[PDB]
Design an enzyme around this catalytic site. Structure first.
Site, PDB file in Angstrom:
ATOM      1  N   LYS A  91      37.832  40.890  33.675  1.00  0.00           N
ATOM      2  CA  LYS A  91      37.154  42.180  33.617  1.00  0.00           C
ATOM      3  C   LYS A  91      35.870  42.169  32.787  1.00  0.00           C
ATOM      4  CE  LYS A  91      40.896  45.293  34.851  1.00  0.00           C
ATOM      5  NZ  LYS A  91      41.839  46.337  34.385  1.00  0.00           N
TER       6      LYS A  91
ATOM      7  N   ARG B  58      48.971  41.424  33.925  1.00  0.00           N
ATOM      8  CA  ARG B  58      48.470  41.394  35.296  1.00  0.00           C
ATOM      9  C   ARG B  58      47.217  40.526  35.379  1.00  0.00           C
ATOM     10  NH1 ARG B  58      44.642  44.070  38.387  1.00  0.00           N
ATOM     11  NH2 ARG B  58      45.272  44.692  40.507  1.00  0.00           N
TER      12      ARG B  58
HETATM   13  C1  LIG Z   1      45.505  47.961  40.317  1.00  0.00           C
HETATM   14  N1  LIG Z   1      44.975  47.701  38.996  1.00  0.00           N
HETATM   15  C2  LIG Z   1      43.725  47.212  38.727  1.00  0.00           C
HETATM   16  N2  LIG Z   1      43.528  47.085  37.428  1.00  0.00           N
HETATM   17  C3  LIG Z   1      44.703  47.514  36.870  1.00  0.00           C
HETATM   18  C4  LIG Z   1      45.038  47.587  35.489  1.00  0.00           C
HETATM   19  O1  LIG Z   1      44.272  47.256  34.593  1.00  0.00           O
HETATM   20  N3  LIG Z   1      46.324  48.075  35.341  1.00  0.00           N
HETATM   21  C5  LIG Z   1      47.189  48.445  36.380  1.00  0.00           C
HETATM   22  N4  LIG Z   1      48.422  48.907  35.972  1.00  0.00           N
HETATM   23  N5  LIG Z   1      46.860  48.365  37.636  1.00  0.00           N
HETATM   24  C6  LIG Z   1      45.617  47.900  37.809  1.00  0.00           C
END
Ligand SMILES: Cn1cnc2c(O)nc(N)nc21
Ligand SMILES: Cn1cnc2c(O)nc(N)nc21
Lengths: 270, 263
Positions: free
Chosen positions: B202, B236
């Site tokens: 990011k 994630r």
């Molecule tokens: C779908 N998505 C994209 N970025 C995300 C993030 O930072 N958190 C979550 N929970 N979903 C995300």
């Protein structure tokens, strides 16, 4: 918190990356590598001419001088980067200081005859690293009742030893010596509690890059250990470690920027 | 002792989990990418069928269903991994659950009409993410949001035992805000709920290091480790293999610690 040597200073208000320059054509390549590491953001270069690996053979003082001194000289005259030297030998300490080395980094903590006195004579920063036994046999059967407590006790004792020899606290760095007479669980016990060594109010140096504490945990060879090494580096720096000794400088410097940004926004982790 | 339950199985949150990103915004290739991520050690797969990125093209209900449902279904049939579905639409929420999704991952926190009810009907875990660039106290604002959203969920019949909180890195937040939230992430444990974070590749890494999206692995790993050291439960990411290795180091470290957490 700062260190002073060779008429300059090292500001330890953010983590520094120390790039490893292993010198065990040769001079030319060494200086090339030092240049790449400096460009990648290393602010200290660690020159070592005797193996510190388990089972390593000793190296004569004349051969260690030939490996280390012209490398240190060439760097100190071409670059502004700080230089540390991995040596246990009084004569290498003296000669290194003479050609511009900034930090004495002895895995044996100046235990060799005359080392303590040669170090003090230099006036240079000295790193005190914990090792159980010696590199020939340290990894045969590392054993501790309480590894944190015994390492901590060692620092207390060695700091006293250096002070009495006229090396003031303001020159000392502490290193728990990951891998030096320690098994996997000993290493992680120390890493988990690294912040607690801040009570000495001294710079902390750590070296975990591509070491067995990553290899034995992931079951991979030395070339597959970058992600684990970064994780170690970040874990250490988040706990306020001041210098991180690594092979992979660019990636580590990037990781430390993120750590620094996080630390700035904080009111250190423990 | 924290666990989640869904589709007859459970997720043990005693250690951090890596959630791999599967972008489907074909079915063959989706399954093969899911296989690679699982082999790399991902224990949750996040499936998205309308991109969550800024200004991504909105799609109809029918299109999103055609994109999302066959992928969730194929993974649920072929693998034991947990499946997170990125959607804001009630109908996709309902149909995803029917073919085996484990987690409803709505960046809009079930704000669309019908979404809250549809989520409650499925009985599935729900991730609440914060999204708004300026704040008086970004942590306090994010914390207030969680309080608000938890209540709204509990009122609709979604018990706290089903919720996860995500601070929403990069969602209505500048560099300073992001690192402010990262630094104080451990404070969000007062809710006694799972924490999910996504920082992979990011802008909070890209702007800090001035490197492109493909050059952010080292910074992404740093973010992950920092979050996981603070007790974050799910990470994630794009780069599963490397993140899993880094989490293994974090787990060895936490297992040696008394608090089992850094604050
Ligand atoms: C779908 N998505 C994209 N970025 C995300 C993030 O930072 N958190 C979550 N929970 N979903 C995300
Ligand atoms: C020379 N050397 C090899 N490993 C080391 C470590 O971990 N610390 C220090 N200070 N020197 C080391």
């Amino acid at each position: 918190m700062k260190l002073f040597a060779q008429g300059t200073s090292l500001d330890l208000s953010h983590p520094h990356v120390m790039g490893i320059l292993n010198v065990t054509n040769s001079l030319i390549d060494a200086v090339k590598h030092a240049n790449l590491m400096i460009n990648a953001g290393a602010t200290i270069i660690d020159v070592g001419g005797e193996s510190t690996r388990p089972g390593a053979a000793e190296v004569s003082v004349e051969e260690e001088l030939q490996r280390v001194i012209p490398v240190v000289e060439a760097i100190a005259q071409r670059f502004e980067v700080w230089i540390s030297v991995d040596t246990s030998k009084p004569e290498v300490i003296r000669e290194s200081a003479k050609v511009g080395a900034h930090i004495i980094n002895d895995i044996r903590s100046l235990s060799e005859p005359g080392a303590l006195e040669a170090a003090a004579e230099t006036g240079l920063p000295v790193c005190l690293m914990h090792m159980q036994g010696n590199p020939k046999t340290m990894q045969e059967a590392p054993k501790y009742d309480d590894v944190f407590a015994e390492v901590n006790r060692y620092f207390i004792e060695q700091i006293a030893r250096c002070e009495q020899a006229g090396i003031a606290k303001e020159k000392l760095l502490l290193d728990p010596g990951f891998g030096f007479g320690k098994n996997l669980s000993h290493n992680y016990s120390l890493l988990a509690r690294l912040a607690e060594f801040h009570h000495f109010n001294l710079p902390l140096l750590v070296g975990m890059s591509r070491k067995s504490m990553i290899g034995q945990l992931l079951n991979v060879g030395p070339s597959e250990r970058l992600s684990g090494s970064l994780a170690c580096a970040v874990i250490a720096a988040m706990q306020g470690a001041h210098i991180i000794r690594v092979h992979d400088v660019k990636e580590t410097v990037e990781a430390m920027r993120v750590v620094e940004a996080t630390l700035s926004a904080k009111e250190r982790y423990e």
